Structure 1
Amino acid sequence: DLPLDPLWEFPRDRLVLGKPLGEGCFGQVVRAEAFGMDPARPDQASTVAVKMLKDNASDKDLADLVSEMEVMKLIGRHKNIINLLGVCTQEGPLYVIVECAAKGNLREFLRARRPPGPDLSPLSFPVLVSCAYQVARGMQYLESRKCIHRDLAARNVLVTEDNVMKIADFGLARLPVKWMAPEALFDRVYTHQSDVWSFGILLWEIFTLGGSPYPGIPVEELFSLLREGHRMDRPPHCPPELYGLMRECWHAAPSQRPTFKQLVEALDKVLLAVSEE
């Protein structure tokens, strides 16, 4: 069984499950409608997402879902992360209610909003910087809460109906080798500074509108190329100020990379200037 948390327990009868959003190995995320999620308007319907176990799940999977739920409570609320909204622990399967991100992941959001490409030739430049800045803010918050993400990439950044960026799967208990810092790749060392390296890759994904990192380069060849000091080229139409930030994230020495605080500060300076360009 699971203890009743007066701060988070939501009534099971006020939650209506909908179509699945995605299925993992033993877990899944589904659409849902919640009634009275905001206590100020207790009859209002709101669209949410529900993390739950699949039928093939074991007690190890249940402990992993419980762990993510508890980590989400400990970390607390931020505008730029997928927030916990409530829980259904009593008289039925465990439901972890979280914020809905109607527009899906950032990579597909950007790919669907691309201008005519090189085989032929919507999102303004300030909106793109705002996306980067929002993700930097969310990461700054997670870091302040002792949370190392380990898998920061555009596929793990979700977009709401209101176009707010929300980092997902921060509470979790082929490998994404192209986003990994070299000390993480080679020495299995994951710090806040290795998340800064991934943020640099994410910045490149933003300014290529969902481009695949290291275009052409075989995965096997990546490691040797990084060891030689090679890094990705400046995306087309990307300003040198933003490419400069990417290159700082990609410094070999973790201590030579910027902090999330400096990234938030540098991205806010660009955003405020570019908003009147």
Structure 2
Amino acid sequence: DLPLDPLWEFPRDRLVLGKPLGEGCFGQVVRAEAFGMDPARPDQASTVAVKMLKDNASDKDLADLVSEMEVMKLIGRHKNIINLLGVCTQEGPLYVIVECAAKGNLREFLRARRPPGSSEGPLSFPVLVSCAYQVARGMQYLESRKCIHRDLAARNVLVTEDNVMKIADFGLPVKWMAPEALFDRVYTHQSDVWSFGILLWEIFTLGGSPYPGIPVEELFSLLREGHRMDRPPHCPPELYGLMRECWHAAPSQRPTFKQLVEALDKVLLAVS
């Protein structure tokens, strides 16, 4: 019983559903071919991802998917987020259609590009910093549209055929959480900044697991006592320094997403 949004409705007969990408409890995501997602060249095919409900699903589940769709509409478009492309709402099940990033999530993209042993891999320093910069730009955008992510991590960043970073799942993990989130259930833009520092560490370990070894119970005590992760091998001091600023206990002493963009920009500018 959903209204027809002229800005977003896409013809159900021009979406060819394909292979499942993932299945939750009461919903799923499938790869699809869409024809005419570019209104200009309307016969062109493109590959998209489609979120939908499973048959085993309640009115609540439907309310949640509608909420995610509407929130994505309101936030609007950016190069560094997974964008809404279209919806199918009429005469059949709810489909929410989004960009499909060819190279999967950033953790897997990094781990698969780990070079053997001590050897050089295809990911240069400037490419790594560029990954971080792009994430920061996406987060600065979401922040300007009043979106707090709450689960920023390399697994929730996707990578396109052209190696563009796109933040996923912004319109719906203790090692990624700020203290105030851990202990006080408080999530702000500044708690997302803490997570971004953890993400930075992931990037510069080529997809390593945070607080390596350290059992998930010693973490809170480590943090309370002023401990943080050590500088990863080959990570320059400047980038470690940024990680450490994001992990200040006091939210107000962490950098803003605007300052992280500017810092990472200075680094990329200095690299010839």
| CA deviation string 1:140-161 (max 9, x = no partner) | 0000000000000000000011
Shift of 1:118: 6.9
| CA deviation string 1:237-262 (max 9, x = no partner) | 00101000000000000000000000
Gaps of 5+ in 1: none
Pairs aligned (count)? 272
Shift of 1:162: 1.3
Q: Report if the CA contact (8 A) 1:125-1:274 is conserved.
A: no
Residue aligned with 1:230, SS: coil
Residue aligned with 2:217, SS: helix
Aligned equivalent of 1:111? 111
Q: Report if the CA contact (8 A) 2:114-2:121 is conserved.
A: no
Shift of 1:102: 1.0
Describe the shift of the 1:257–1:13 C-alpha distance in structure 2 as closer, same or farther (beyond 3 A): same
Task: Return the alpha-carbon distance in structure 2 between the equivalents of residues 235 and 80 of structure 1.
Answer: 26
Describe the shift of the 1:34–1:146 C-alpha distance in structure 2 as closer, same or farther (beyond 3 A): same
Shift of 1:273: 1.6
Q: Report if the CA contact (8 A) 1:14-1:36 is conserved.
A: yes
| CA deviation string 1:63-104 (max 9, x = no partner) | 000000000000000000000000000010100000011100
| CA deviation string 1:91-144 (max 9, x = no partner) | 101000000111000000000000123799911111110000000000000000
Describe the shift of the 1:239–1:119 C-alpha distance in structure 2 as closer, same or farther (beyond 3 A): closer
Aligned equivalent of 1:184? 181
Q: Report if the CA contact (8 A) 2:113-2:121 is conserved.
A: no
Residue aligned with 2:239, SS: helix
CA RMSD of aligned residues (A): 1.8
Q: Report if the CA contact (8 A) 2:21-2:30 is conserved.
A: yes
Q: Report if the CA contact (8 A) 1:26-1:56 is conserved.
A: yes
Task: Return the alpha-carbon distance in structure 2 between the equivalents of residues 199 and 27 of structure 1.
Answer: 28
| CA deviation string 1:38-64 (max 9, x = no partner) | 111010001111011122111100000
Task: Return the alpha-carbon distance in structure 1 between the equivalents of residues 39 and 163 of structure 2.
Answer: 25
Aligned equivalent of 2:265? 268
| Sequence identity percentage | 99
Q: Report if the CA contact (8 A) 2:49-2:97 is conserved.
A: yes
Residue aligned with 1:269, SS: helix
Q: Report if the CA contact (8 A) 1:105-1:159 is conserved.
A: yes
Shift of 1:274: 2.2
Describe the shift of the 1:121–1:272 C-alpha distance in structure 2 as closer, same or farther (beyond 3 A): closer
| CA deviation string 1:209-245 (max 9, x = no partner) | 0000000100000000000000000010001010000
Q: Report if the CA contact (8 A) 1:248-1:258 is conserved.
A: yes
Residue aligned with 1:91, SS: coil
Describe the shift of the 1:160–1:6 C-alpha distance in structure 2 as closer, same or farther (beyond 3 A): same
**TM-score normalised to the size of structure 1?**
0.96
Task: Return the alpha-carbon distance in structure 1 between the equivalents of residues 164 and 73 of structure 2.
Answer: 21
Task: Return the alpha-carbon distance in structure 2 between the equivalents of residues 94 and 128 of structure 1.
Answer: 38
Task: Return the alpha-carbon distance in structure 2 between the equivalents of residues 205 and 9 of structure 1.
Answer: 38
Q: Report if the CA contact (8 A) 1:101-1:161 is conserved.
A: yes
Q: Report if the CA contact (8 A) 2:231-2:240 is conserved.
A: yes
Task: Return the alpha-carbon distance in structure 2 between the equivalents of residues 182 and 264 of structure 1.
Answer: 23
Aligned equivalent of 2:242? 245
Q: Report if the CA contact (8 A) 1:80-1:137 is conserved.
A: yes
Aligned equivalent of 1:56? 56
Shift of 1:34: 0.6
Shift of 1:265: 0.4
Structure 1 runs (4+) greater than 4 angstroms displaced = 118-121
Gaps of 5+ in 2: none
Q: Report if the CA contact (8 A) 1:9-1:87 is conserved.
A: yes
Task: Return the alpha-carbon distance in structure 2 between the equivalents of residues 190 and 120 of structure 1.
Answer: 39
Task: Return the alpha-carbon distance in structure 2 between the equivalents of residues 114 and 121 of structure 1.
Answer: 6
**Which range moves more in the overlay, 101-110 or 49-58?**
49-58
**TM-score normalised to the size of structure 2?**
0.98
